[PDB]
């Protein structure tokens, strides 16, 4: 909704921040196994349920 509580909006912003991939420099670390973030979601694929 347009109308929302202040703390609810900040939890919406955090979910936007966490919907990002692994940076390139992190993928070049030695002994690295983290290439894709599996905690990723999209608005039309999975509803975050909050």
């Amino acid at each position: 909704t347009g109308h929302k509580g202040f703390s609810y909006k900040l939890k919406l912003g955090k979910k936007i921040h966490q919907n990002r991939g692994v940076p390139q420099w992190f993928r070049m670390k030695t002994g690295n196994t983290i290439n894709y973030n599996f905690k990723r979601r999209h608005w039309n694929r999975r509803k975050m349920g909050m």
Binding site: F6, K9, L10, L12, G13, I16, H17
Partner: protein, 60 residues
């Protein structure tokens, strides 16, 4: 246009600008961004030109 702390209100942001930059403020409009920061729209007095104030800060 500044990025500030969400806990600071329009009166604290106004006083911080005059103290930090030595200008006169006539209007402050604030919005809270999704990432959490508070964007402040600080308008200066007509007798003060923000072109030199921004240059001293380093924007230009």
């Amino acid at each position: 246009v500044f990025l500030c702390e969400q806990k600071a209100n329009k009166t604290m942001i106004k006083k911080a600008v005059e103290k930090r930059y030595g200008v006169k403020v006539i209007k402050v409009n604030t919005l809270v961004r999704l990432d959490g920061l508070k964007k402040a729209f600080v308008r200066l007095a007509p007798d003060v030109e923000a072109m030199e104030v921004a240059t001293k800060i380093g924007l230009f």
